[PDB]
């Protein structure tokens, strides 16, 4: 489609990865480990896939609380215009699909 397609698709991946690299190299192995364990715990707390979820704990742990991007303000996913079956959506998240 476009170069930016994938640069934006994996934007967050290929940033927090770089954060963990920096912390490994300066602070130590512990510093990524600690941040990772917090993030995964607070993104085991959201709604089922099929309802649009407000993950205040994960956002403020990243420092996104006080920062907007195009991610937020384009292609509004909270008024998603294409949703599936509740049960089948949840199965996909579980990895039964």
């Amino acid at each position: 489609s476009h170069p930016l397609e994938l640069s934006e698709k994996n934007f967050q991946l290929n940033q927090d990865k770089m954060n963990f690299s920096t912390l490994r190299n300066i602070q130590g192995l512990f510093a990524p480990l600690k941040l990772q364990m917090e993030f995964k715990a607070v993104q085991q707390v959201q709604r089922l896939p099929f309802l649009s979820s407000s993950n205040l704990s994960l956002d403020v742990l990243r420092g996104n609380d006080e920062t907007i991007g195009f991610e937020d303000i384009l292609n509004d996913p909270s008024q998603s215009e294409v949703m599936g079956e509740p049960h089948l959506m949840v199965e996909y998240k579980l990895g039964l699909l």
Binding site: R24, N25, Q27, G28, L29, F30, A31, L33, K34, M37, A41
Partner: protein, 243 residues
């Protein structure tokens, strides 16, 4: 006590204690002593190492892992978990020698791995490491340094603490002693002597104690004490228990 508050690591008690880390400090105690006295000239280690079977081929059940070149370690509690943190330290120091180029400061290695232990003492699911370890290094520009890293995950340096079983016994015999204008060999005699003192032949079986060191002797890189010198230290030890 806290018998409602010792079932995960994410709980406090009525008087703000976590009991997982305090029972990981019961864990280090279960294992026989490992001592080691920072000298004027680098560091020495001894360890009350309790040979389990004669079947086991000498080299087995090691207590003195050599994290890096400049540094080596002296461990107690679980051997599984001691090797786990030996490998953390090894990796930390290796990538420090990749990034900054030069031997990791002992202080920095020590802090790093202590904060890694702490990462496992926070999050309920995972338990603390069931052991303490004692890094020790010499450099010509740095000097003697000893750092001791708890099951809870703190990092203070010492001039001759112990970890494990009869390790307050060891401490009191190391502060019945000076280690300030003493060299490797002077201290390695005293270190064999203190392992001998603190060891109990009534409670424990055959002990094949292990003596390591670092210093100008070794060329600021952790070695194991030559048989000759170790055996003369263990003779001095036997004779100081005879006297």
């Amino acid at each position: 006590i806290g018998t409602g508050y010792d079932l995960s690591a994410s709980t406090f008690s009525p008087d703000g204690r976590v009991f997982q880390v305090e029972y990981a400090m019961k864990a280090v105690e279960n294992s026989s002593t490992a001592i080691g006295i920072r000298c004027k000239d680098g560091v020495v280690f001894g360890v009350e190492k309790l040979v389990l079977s004669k079947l086991y081929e000498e080299g087995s059940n090691k207590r003195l892992f050599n994290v890096d070149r400049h540094v080596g370690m002296a461990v107690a509690g679980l051997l599984a978990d001691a090797r786990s943190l030996a490998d953390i330290a090894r990796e930390e120091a290796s990538n420090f020698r990749s990034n900054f180029g030069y031997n990791i400061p002992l202080k920095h290695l020590a802090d790093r791995v202590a904060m890694y232990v702490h990462a496992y003492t926070l999050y309920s699911a995972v338990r603390p490491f069931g052991c303490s370890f004692m890094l020790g290094s010499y450099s010509v520009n740095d000097g003697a340094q000893l750092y001791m890293i708890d099951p809870s995950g703190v990092s203070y340096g010492y001039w001759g603490c112990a970890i494990g079983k009869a390790r307050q016994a060891a401490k009191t015999e190391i502060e019945k002693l000076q280690m300030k204008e003493m060299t490797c060999r002077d201290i390695v005699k005293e270190v064999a002597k203190i392992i001998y003192i603190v060891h109990d032949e009534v409670k424990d079986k055959a002990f094949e104690l292990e003596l390591s060191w670092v210093g100008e002797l070794t060329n600021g890189r952790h070695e194991i004490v030559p048989k000759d010198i170790r055996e003369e230290a263990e003779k001095y030890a036997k004779e100081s228990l005879k006297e």
